[PDB]
DNA sequence: GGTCAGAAAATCGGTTGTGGTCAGCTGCTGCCACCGGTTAACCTC
């Protein structure tokens, strides 16, 4: 009545699992913020980046102090800055001093 | 699997220099083929001598006297 | 009535050489995916 066909997106090879003449491997070590080593077996002919994602949840950096670069991180959209893009310093400071005078006359009496 | 074993036997029916030449030519020992002058460097003769040996060995393998067991593996 | 000596094969191996061909590499060539500004369409201050 209803017989179909189908396959998952992937092909299957047929090799032999030899365990001696493998590719030469360098073992690299990374580290997260919370002291979590994650041993990464690379190739021996392989560039080692300073940072690498781990199962710990974050991009764990290298265990070396060779590449400590923290530079390119900033919040591009702060409410203060997008306030500054539409409101001027004297207008904002006038509003601030008016509300300060109001709360001085309210709390003081 | 039987093809791999029959290939190993027929490859070992010939001598070791041309055997390792074919193995390095096709990556049957490591999965990575080599250049002709690379095989000539790791053996000890020039790459053109290597090419002559390779061509005549390929003809010897192509001969029916050794192609009997691989005639209909396709 | 032997006797080194030369000519000429073939055979493994360099060589040179050279020619081409292709893997790939990579700066233009140009098209293609978000991003949002604007421009004629709906509800009544």
UniProtKB/Swiss-Prot annotation, chain A:
HAMAP family: RbpA. Belongs to the RNA polymerase-binding protein RbpA family. The keyword Transcription regulation applies. This is RNA polymerase-binding protein RbpA. Transmembrane segments: none annotated. GO terms for molecular function: bacterial-type RNA polymerase core enzyme binding. GO terms for biological process: positive regulation of DNA-templated transcription. Pfam families: RbpA. Keywords: Transcription, Transcription regulation. It comes from the Bacteria. The lineage of its organism: Bacteria, Bacillati, Actinomycetota, Actinomycetes, Mycobacteriales. Forms a complex with the RNAP catalytic core and with free principal sigma factors. Binds to RNA polymerase (RNAP), stimulating transcription from principal, but not alternative sigma factor promoters. InterPro entries: RbpA_sf (IPR038638), RNApol-bd_RbpA (IPR025182). The keyword Methyltransferase does not apply.
